[PDB]
RNA sequence: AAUAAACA
């Protein structure tokens, strides 16, 4: 009944964008958001991995967001963003320095029930605007609710005008914008005072109109100053046009629009659709053909408009001026083509973004050409898993042999990404699976170290044995080496490079060698008392540490180079645990050219940075091991195993603190915050993270920086639970799990000839492998993911098994030509004769295709094309039982389809079963083995509209019915139908249990017998669910019904005929409730990796590009965490105000059983001082719960 | 293809135990019912089923040999007391009336019996 | 068999 919901995958796809100064007055910062996560980019032009988006913070919500807007208040330093959440929320938030997170400014909560007028259903989004001059700002509550915030505490008190209640009888607002010019905030208004639809205009010709409210703040009056009233029926959003010009241009679908106060109107048509449709004065525009529904806009400085339609298409509209700064005609030119947006931004000027949800959101840059026609480049794109509408388990094709009798499922993920000319296939795949090309076995050696030998090629690779040293000479073929260098006779606990890997030195307990590869220049004993534990290495530092603390620094000089002793001087009130050496090729490490940083923790829980040269203290906390999440200099207790200062990024930018504190992982950010305290301290501070891992079950290092590894630099978390830590030049952190080859000792970078760029690393049964990463996914996304462009709406994906490939149902677009009528005879096709000025309809044509996994190509002479207006509703893979194999099933394709002819044709409907076999190739072209032979291709009386199997019978839907056919030699048999409801749109079914999915009414259960023909109706759900998709929690012993909604919901049903609140056996039970940030339409499940022996989690991708999960608990493990949850909402501050528990609620009783792991990974986050008080104030211990929270952790790390 | 990885053959669900035994069915009420949307008791064809008339799921008996035309459409005012039969087995239904007796039909797609 | 064909 309980359960615990866990966010795989952040949503990727950005539905809102703006350009404001977030950090600072300084630079302009890019802030993106999506639903429910905040982003904000800077701009790169100089990168290696040349202009790039470059993330520098990233914000999750407990709230999606529907609107987002930025005004720069009285005196501040800082630009505030007025977020909008859902049923009108308002919320004004704040960067922050210090504390690298956000800041509340203000709360406005407006979900009043008098604030509706009765209506429920709130289907107007809150809209955010602002005055550019910066007096005010308005939202549009609810459609028919202007609040309004005045600003000069930075704030005055709100009021809400009522829209219904003004002047004209607005009611039923479409956009709303601040004018420009002008001495008070101005709002023109767009509404629809005696509504109409695009397909009734013979009765209602023209009902748009405009008012341009005047907001008095002060005496709160508003005067309704310039009206019109018989715009074209159809427009879209308006928008205002700068200062220099004024006005404001209404995007109608077929038109264009230019109005102003003292300005006659001037608006010229698109189409030749505006002929019987409008009666607003339009002139002609010449050489455009096109429309504007779904057109985002911004503005270039003064008259051009950069407008990208429906379909990608960039067009830069110039506005004639006259000599009296009044609009005289248009001007188009037709630029490049490019995404389907959501959103639009003019960055630096030459640079646009284009937010979109479905496809990648990518940053342009257009140019001047030699009147001023604009070239675009694409420069940037974000990566973007779009709404994945359906998304298949696969098993990848290059898994080494070595890990190929591993216990566990290996497999991947390929999910239906974006829409249309942006659609296409994305290969998630969580972890990292290596290729090992070469593997070892050496036991006895427990460490190792690759150094430099004479662009630059490992060319010893060094391994410390308990009582001895292994060379091992790299080149052609590597082998042991035998002879004179290095010290063979004794373990060695560091080796590495200075200068720059001019020399080679490893670090004995006795002494220190220098080393030009296999000569020796001269060794210099360490005469301490203890023995050398461990060190750090500069390019022209050797700081060594002894075993009772004390510290040497080691120093090349010239002559030929040569290690110099020097003693550092410091105060050893208490004995120094472990250390860390820094560099900055590109320092934020200021205290005011590589600049070298020495850090040191000692026993007492403090924590040191020095500057290197000098021995001075230029940071301090006082009390590093809990864990506190922010390290602010102040210039029992757990141990410090290690200690690592990384810079990662572009040119060695931004640092991180990773450190190993007793069996827990906590890592840093590091970020400037100028502090004045004058006398020379480093004016950065530390943030941490969040995690998924953890760190439970000489001296050996877990924490090994690697840089050139598939382009990629970064560090390899060794341990229990391995992980990656990438960072590219994004910017962004990265933590890609490695659970293959179990837990990892060591690790090493690796650069071969006959290897590439690759890495190296022992196993745990001491099994050394030289491997190489996967070369065809990027790295670079939260999950590993490679994006397949198909150019063409992907609407399924099915991994048929047998044969191992996918089957894709794919859509382009075809301009219609003929309307279909049925007169009584047969149907007759009208073909559309209409004027040159016209644009036509869009017919999609379907076609299955055939990609294949070995490459990712698709398969040529394998693509079923389907009829003129036929539409595929379904693709899966169906097991349909034989006589042929040694089992029963086969494992087909099947794919329902129907036509769409409009509703005065009936529409009617034919069942595609499919199957992939494997020919012989064509020579030349060995994809071209797999190919379709479509065994079943009869129409049905009826659409079809999902499939099912169960127990070998295909279970189709076709109409108000359900059918079983079974597959005989060349026809289907009919079995068992029943009547269902309206329109069954989803259907899965597992053991003769079909659960059903209708549009609006319910989900069914029904159930097959074999020994009498019959299906029947078990258990419905009796009142109305607008479903999306649904799906199985499978128990121990109970079934759970996940069922998604339209509503951005999940819930779990069952089936009990013994409860009394239901009727006996015959409505079915919710019995958790959650609410999901985003729309979902795929769902699997898996088993997890005696409790866990039969429960299974049961992912989903959102429709927003993220992948959830609900992992199954039992009661005491739930009630452990409620009472954690519950203490964990309240005492905590929030981002941007929000209340987790009233956002994860049902969204219409609220029976809520689903907990939040992405609220209970803040307890994960708390310092361990934090984190014992929280335990107390519920009644347990901090090592229970996390006994219970990374056991939902370690069961959920697949793919 | 949901059966290589989660497979749930070995599991006896609560679900599947609700089903084979009923699990407290309530005999319906207003005996002049017909049974509809109910699959099948399994006390009635092995043993004795226990409650006679007012009982959930349906009764079955021989000697049907044609498929009932009304129950397709979902119109079976007589239920379990109907001489005809309720599967959907494309060769047990009636001669077509009008190619038995009026020569030809009409329709293109008549799923009738057409004899000679 | 109880309206399969209830047509303009
Ligand atoms: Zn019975
Ligand atoms: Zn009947
Ligand atoms: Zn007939």
């Known amino acids: 009944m309980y359960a615990v919901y866990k966010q795989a995958h952040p949503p990727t796809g950005l539905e809102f964008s703006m350009y404001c100064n977030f950090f600072n007055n300084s630079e302009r910062n890019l802030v993106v958001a999506g639903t429910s996560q905040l982003y904000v980019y800077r701009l790169n032009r100089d990168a290696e991995a040349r202009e790039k988006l470059e993330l520098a913070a990233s914000f999750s919500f407990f709230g999606n967001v529907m609107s987002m807007a930025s005004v720069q208040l009285a005196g501040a330093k800082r630009d505030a963003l007025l977020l909008s959440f859902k049923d009108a929320k308002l919320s004004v938030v704040e960067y922050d320095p210090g504390t690298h997170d956000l800041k509340t400014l203000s709360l406005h909560y407006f979900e009043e029930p008098e604030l509706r007028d009765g209506f429920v259903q709130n289907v107007h989004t809150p809209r955010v605007r602002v005055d550019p001059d910066g007096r005010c700002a308005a939202m549009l509550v609810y459609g028919t609710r202007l609040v309004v915030l005045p600003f000069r505490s930075s704030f005055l008190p709100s009021y809400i005008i009522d829209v219904r209640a003004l002047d004209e009888k607005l009611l039923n607002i479409i956009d709303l914008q601040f004018l420009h010019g002008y001495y008070e905030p101005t709002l023109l208004i ?235 296939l994305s290969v998630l795949q969580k972890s990292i699976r290596p290729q090992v090309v070469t593997t070892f076995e050496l036991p006895g050696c427990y460490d190792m ?426 693709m899966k893979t169906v097991s349909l039982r034989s006589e042929e194999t040694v089992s029963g099933l086969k494992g087909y394709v099947a794919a329902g389809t129907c036509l769409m002819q409009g509703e005065e044709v009936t529409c009617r409907g034919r069942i595609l079963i499919m199957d992939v076999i494997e020919v012989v190739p064509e020579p030349g072209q060995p994809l071209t083995k797999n190919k379709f032979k479509v065994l079943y291709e009869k129409e049905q009386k009826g659409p079809v509209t999902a499939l099912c199997h169960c127990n070998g019978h295909l279970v189709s839907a076709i109409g108000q019915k359900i059918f079983l056919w079974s597959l005989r030699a060349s026809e289907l048999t009919g079995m068992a139908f029943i009547d269902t409801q309206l329109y069954i749109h989803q259907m899965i079914s597992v053991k003769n249990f079909i659960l059903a999915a209708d549009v609006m009414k319910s989900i069914s259960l029904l159930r097959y017998q074999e020994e009498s023909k019959t299906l029947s109706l078990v258990s419905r759900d009796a009142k109305p669910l607008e479903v999306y998709s649904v799906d199985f929690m499978v128990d121990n012993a109970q079934l759970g019904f996940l069922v998604s909604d339209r509503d951005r919901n999940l819930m779990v049903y069952m089936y009990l005929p013994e409860a009394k609140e239901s009727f006996g056996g015959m409505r079915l039970l919710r019995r958790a409730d959650f609410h999901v940030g985003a729309h979902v339409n795929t769902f699997w499940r898996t088993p997890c990796r005696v409790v866990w022996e039969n429960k299974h989690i049961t992912w989903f991708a959102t429709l927003d590009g993220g992948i959830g999960l609900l992992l199954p608990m039992q009661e005491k493990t739930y009630r452990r965490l409620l009472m954690l949850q519950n203490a964990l909402t309240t005492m905590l501050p929030h981002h941007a105000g929000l209340n987790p528990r009233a956002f994860r609620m049902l969204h219409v009783n609220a029976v809520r059983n689903v907990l939040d792991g992405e609220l209970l990974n803040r307890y994960l986050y708390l310092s361990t001082m934090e984190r014992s008080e929280l335990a107390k104030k519920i009644g347990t211990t901090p090592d229970i719960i996390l006994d219970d929270l990374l056991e939902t952790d370690r069961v959920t790390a697949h793919f | 293809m949901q059966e290589i990885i989660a497979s749930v053959d070995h599991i006896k669900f609560d679900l599947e135990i609700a089903v084979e035994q009923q699990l407290g069915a309530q005999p319906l009420p207003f005996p002049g019912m017909d049974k509809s949307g109910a699959a099948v008791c399994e006390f009635f064809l092995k043993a004795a089923c226990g409650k006679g008339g007012m009982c959930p799921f349906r009764h079955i008996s021989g000697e049907k040999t044609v498929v009932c035309k009304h129950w397709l459409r979902g119109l079976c005012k007589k239920g379990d007391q109907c001489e005809f039969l309720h599967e959907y087995d494309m060769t047990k239904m009636p001669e077509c009336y009008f190619y038995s007796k009026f020569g030809e039909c009409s329709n293109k797609e008549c799923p009738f019996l057409h004899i000679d």
């Open chain 1, 190 to 424: 767009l509404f629809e005072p005696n509504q109409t639809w695009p397909g009734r205009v013979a009765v209602r010709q023209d009902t748009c109109s405009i008012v341009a409210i005047s907001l008095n703040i002060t005496q709160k009056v508003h005067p309704v100053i310039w009206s019109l009233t018989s715009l074209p029926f159809d427009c879209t959003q308006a928008l205002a046009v700068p200062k220099p010009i004024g006005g404001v241009v209404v995007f109608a679908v077929n038109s264009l629009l230019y109005l102003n106060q003292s300005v006659p109107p001037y608006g010229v048509a698109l189409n030749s659709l505006t002929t019987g449709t409008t009666a607003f004065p339009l002139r002609t525009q010449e050489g455009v053909r096109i429309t504007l529904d779904c057109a985002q806009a911004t503005f270039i400085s003064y008259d051009k408009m950069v407008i990208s339609l429906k379909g990608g298409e960039i067009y830069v509209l110039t506005l004639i001026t006259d000599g009296m700064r009044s609009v005289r005609a248009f001007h188009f030119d037709k630029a490049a083509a490019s995404v389907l947006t959501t959103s639009m931004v003019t960055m630096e000027p030459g640079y646009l973004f284009l937010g979109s949800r479905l496809g990648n959101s990518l940053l342009l840059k257009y140019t001047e050409k030699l009147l001023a026609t604009y070239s675009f480049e694409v420069c940037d794109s974000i990566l973007n898993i779009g709404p994945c509408a359906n998304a298949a388990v696969g098993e990848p094709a290059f898994l080494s042999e070595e890990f190929q009798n591993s216990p566990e499922p290996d497999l991947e993920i390929v999910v239906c990404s974006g829409h249309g000319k942006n659609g296409a």
């Open chain 1, 449 to 874: 170290w690759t150094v430099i030998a004479p662009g630059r090629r490992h060319g010893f690779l060094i391994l410390s044995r308990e009582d001895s040293t292994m060379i091992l000479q790299t080149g052609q073929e590597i082998m042991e080496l035998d002879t004179s260098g290095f010290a063979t006779q004794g373990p060695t606990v560091f080796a590495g490079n200075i200068g720059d890997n001019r020399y080679i030195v490893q670090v004995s307990p006795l002494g220190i060698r220098l080393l030009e590869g296999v000569n020796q220049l001269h060794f210099i004993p360490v005469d301490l008392g203890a023995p050398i534990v461990q060190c750090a290495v500069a390019d022209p530092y050797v700081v060594i540490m002894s075993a009772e603390g004390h510290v040497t620094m080691f120093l090349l000089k010239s002559d030929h180079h040569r290690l110099a002793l020097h003693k550092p001087p410091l105060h050893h009130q208490s004995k120094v645990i472990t250390l860390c050496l820094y560099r900055d090729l590109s320092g934020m490490f200021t205290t005011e050219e590589p600049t070298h940083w020495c850090l040191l923790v000692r026993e007492n829980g403090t924590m040191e940075i020095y500057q290197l040269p000098d021995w001075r203290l230029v940071f301090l906390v006082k009390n590093f091991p809990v864990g506190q999440r922010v390290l602010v200099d102040s210039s029992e207790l757990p141990l410090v195993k290690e200690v690592l200062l990384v810079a990662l990024g572009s040119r060695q930018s931004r640092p991180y603190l990773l450190v190993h504190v007793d069996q827990e992982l906590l890592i840093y950010e590091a970020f400037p915050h100028d502090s004045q305290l004058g006398q020379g301290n480093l004016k950065v501070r530390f943030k941490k993270v969040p995690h998924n891992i953890n760190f439970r079950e000489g001296r050996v290092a877990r924490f090994r920086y690697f840089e050139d590894i598939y382009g990629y630099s970064g560090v390899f978390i060794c341990g229990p639970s391995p992980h990656w830590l990438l960072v590219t030049g994004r910017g962004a952190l990265r933590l890609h799990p490695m659970a293959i080859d179990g837990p990892v000792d060591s690790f090493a970078p690796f650069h071969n000839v006959n290897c590439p760029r690759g890495f190296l690393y022992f196993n745990r049964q001491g099994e050394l492998r030289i491997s190489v990463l996967p070369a065809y996914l990027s790295y670079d996304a939260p999950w590993p993911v490679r994006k397949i462009p198909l150019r063409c709406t992907a609407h399924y994906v099915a991994y048929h098994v047998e044969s191992k490939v996918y089957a894709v149902a794919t859509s382009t677009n075809t301009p219609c030509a003929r309307i279909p009528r049925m007169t009584g005879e047969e149907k007759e096709f009208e073909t559309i004769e209409r004027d040159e000025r016209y644009i036509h309809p869009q017919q999609e044509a379907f076609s299955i295709q055939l990609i294949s996994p070995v490459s990712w190509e698709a398969i040529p002479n394998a693509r079923i094309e389907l009829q003129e207006w036929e539409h595929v509703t379904c």
